[PDB]
Structures are given as C-alpha cells and as structure tokens.
Amino acid sequence: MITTPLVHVASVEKGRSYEDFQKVYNAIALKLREDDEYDNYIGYGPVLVRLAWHISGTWDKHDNTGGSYGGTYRFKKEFNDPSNAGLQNGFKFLEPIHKEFPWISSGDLFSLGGVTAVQEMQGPKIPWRAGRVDTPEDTTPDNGRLPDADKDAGYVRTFFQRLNMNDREVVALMGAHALGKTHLKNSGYEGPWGCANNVFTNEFYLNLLNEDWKLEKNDANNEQWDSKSGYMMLPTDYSLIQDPKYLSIVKEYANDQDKFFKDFSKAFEKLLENGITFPKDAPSPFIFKTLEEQGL
Numbered sequence: 001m002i003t004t005p006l007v008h009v010a011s012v013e014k015g016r017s018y019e020d021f022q023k024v025y026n027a028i029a030l031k032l033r034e035d036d037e038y039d040n041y042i043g044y045g046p047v048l049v050r051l052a053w054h055i056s057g058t059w060d061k062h063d064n065t066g067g068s069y070g071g072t073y074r075f076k077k078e079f080n081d082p083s084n085a086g087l088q089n090g091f092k093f094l095e096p097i098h099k100e101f102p103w104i105s106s107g108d109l110f111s112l113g114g115v116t117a118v119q120e121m122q123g124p125k126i127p128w129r130a131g132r133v134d135t136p137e138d139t140t141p142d143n144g145r146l147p148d149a150d151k152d153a154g155y156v157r158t159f160f161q162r163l164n165m166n167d168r169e170v171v172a173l174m175g176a177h178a179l180g181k182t183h184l185k186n187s188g189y190e191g192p193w194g195c196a197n198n199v200f201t202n203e204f205y206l207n208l209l210n211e212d213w214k215l216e217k218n219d220a221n222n223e224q225w226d227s228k229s230g231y232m233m234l235p236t237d238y239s240l241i242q243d244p245k246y247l248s249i250v251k252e253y254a255n256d257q258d259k260f261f262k263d264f265s266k267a268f269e270k271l272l273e274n275g276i277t278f279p280k281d282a283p284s285p286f287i288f289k290t291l292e293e294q295g296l
C-alpha cells in the first residue's frame with residue numbers, strides 16, 4: 001500500500017441554485033443582526049469566521065485529508081478538539097439554521113457562515129461555491145492540525161505551507177485577528193486586538209505597527225504582547241512583525257485597506273476550497289448580496 005491523495009468532487013445540492021443559497025445567507029445574516037448580545041455585544045460574527053477557518057484548517061495538502069469538504073466538525077472527535085474550544089457557540093448558532101434548510105451539507109453551511117459573517121461585517125465580498133458533501137465519521141481528522149499560538153514566524157511560515165498558502169496569503173488571512181478577541185478559558189489567551197472588533201477593517205495591521213507592545217504573562221501563565229491601550233497580540237501575531245518578509249506585507253496592508261481586502265477575499269476563498277475538485281461543468285462562484293444591498 002500506497003497513498004494516492006483522495007479526490008473530493010463538489011456535487012451541488014440536488015436541485016439548488018443561486019437563490020437557495022442566498023436564502024441561507026440572509027438567514028444567517030438576519031440572525032447575526034438579531035443575536036447582538038453574544039460575547040459582550042461583540043456578536044456571533046467573529047466566531048463564525050473562526051469556525052469557517054478551523055473547519056478548513058485541518059487540511060493537509062499531501063494526502064488530502066481534512067478541509068471543508070466533509071463537514072467532519074459535526075463529529076465529536078473534531079468537535080472536541082482542544083483547538084476548537086469556543087467553536088461550539090458557532091455550531092449552536094448555525095443549528096436552527098440547519099433546521100430551516102436541512103438540505104444544505106455541513107461543510108457548505110459552515111463555510112457559508114464565515115463568508116456571511118465576513119460580508120455582514122462590512123468586509124469584502126467572498127465568492128463562494130457550493131458542493132461540499134458530508135462524509136462519514138471515520139473521515140474525521142485527528143486532533144492537532146491547527147496551529148499553536150506560542151510560536152514564531154518560522155513556525156507560521158512552515159505551517160501555512162501545509163495549506164498551500166504563501167507569505168502574502170498568510171498575512172492577508174491573519175488580519176482576521178481584528179475580529180473578536182481571546183478568551184482565557186478557551187485558549188489560555190486573554191483580550192482583544194483592537195477597538196472595532198466586529199467591523200472588518202485593517203485595524204490589525206495598524207495596531208501591530210503603531211502600538212507600544214510588551215511581552216507579559218497572562219493569568220494563564222503564557223506570554224502575550226500587550227499594548228497599553230488594552231489590546232493584545234499572539235506571539236504568532238507579533239511575528240508578522242519580526243519577520244522581515246512578513247513585516248513589509250503588514251505595512252502594505254496597513255497602508256491600503258483596499259489591497260488588503262482583495263488579497264484576503266481571494267485567500268479566504270482558497271482556504272475554504274482547498275481539497276475540492278469542482279467539476280468543469282460546475283457553476284461559478286456566487287457572490288451574495290448583503291442584506292443592505294437587498295433592502296432587508
């Protein structure tokens with residue numbers, strides 16, 4: 001025995017088109033607007049984006065294991081990954097939604113939520129594609145493919161390689177750290193990254209470059225970069241600044257929100273599609289209208 005990389009073919013939910021997804025979208029979107037009290041009124045947007053990434057983040061380019069495709073997060077093994085501590089809130093918010101549209105696969109719904117959360121938070125438009133098919137439980141990836149936080153630029157670069165992401169991709173995607181914040185209880189990390197943490201903007205790069213960062217120890221006994229302004233950064237975050245390579249992307253993005261959003265949009269979609277072979281007859285990526293765009 002030899003390891004051919006699996007091949008995952010996207011098969012659109014039987015009989016669904018643009019209009020159906022848009023509906024899933026608006027639901028998620030409306031429920032975001034409605035459950036505003038979550039996490040100190042930060043809302044469910046950031047967790048939802050955290051959920052889409054972590055479901056895609058199990059991917060291993062070599063043997064085509066993990067990734068969005070299978071919706072394996074719905075299983076225990078994955079669901080209980082110490083790395084996904086806190087994600088249950090997102091699962092919990094997506095549920096009722098899955099009730100209303102039972103016909104959507106899990107990878108599809110989970111991926112779709114992140115996209116929504118992104119657009120709903122005024123970030124860019126992320127072209128999405130349907131077609132992920134739930135896979136059995138044995139197809140769940142063992143715990144541990146998710147990055148550790150107490151590392152450096154070397155680790156982060158080596159890590160992203162497994163997901164086929166390059167430096168510009170890594171920095172673009174990291175910017176999502178402007179959303180939500182760290183909860184000690186989840187991660188051993190505590191605190192926000194900046195002020196506008198439920199509106200997607202380039203705040204993370206700016207902060208990274210303009211604040212006065214100091215390595216301290218949290219109540220969890222780990223080290224984090226604290227700014228006097230009350231923000232924080234992970235070591236992996238602070239590293240985007242020690243690497244010289246990384247550092248000029250950060251500057252470019254802190255300099256142009258615009259580029260930043262294009263770069264992210266293209267990479268986030270990639271993250272969400274890693275591992276899936278879409279047939280050529282497959283349709284194009286949809287691009288959901290936001291509620292606003294819809295007058296809803």
Ligand code: HEM
Pocket residue numbers: 046047049050053085086147148149156173174176177178179180181182183184185186187188189234236268
């Ligand atoms: C080196 C890579 C990464 C590491 C080590 C890292 C780790 C972290 C940690 C530990 C937290 C706090 C979790 C908690 O305590 O609730 C966090 C939060 C989160 N992560 Fe990352 N992150 C990684 C990559 C990224 C990626 C690429 C994305 C999205 C594109 C991102 C999006 C988020 C967001 C939006 C949250 C906020 C979660 C919330 O507010 O509950 N992260 N991540």
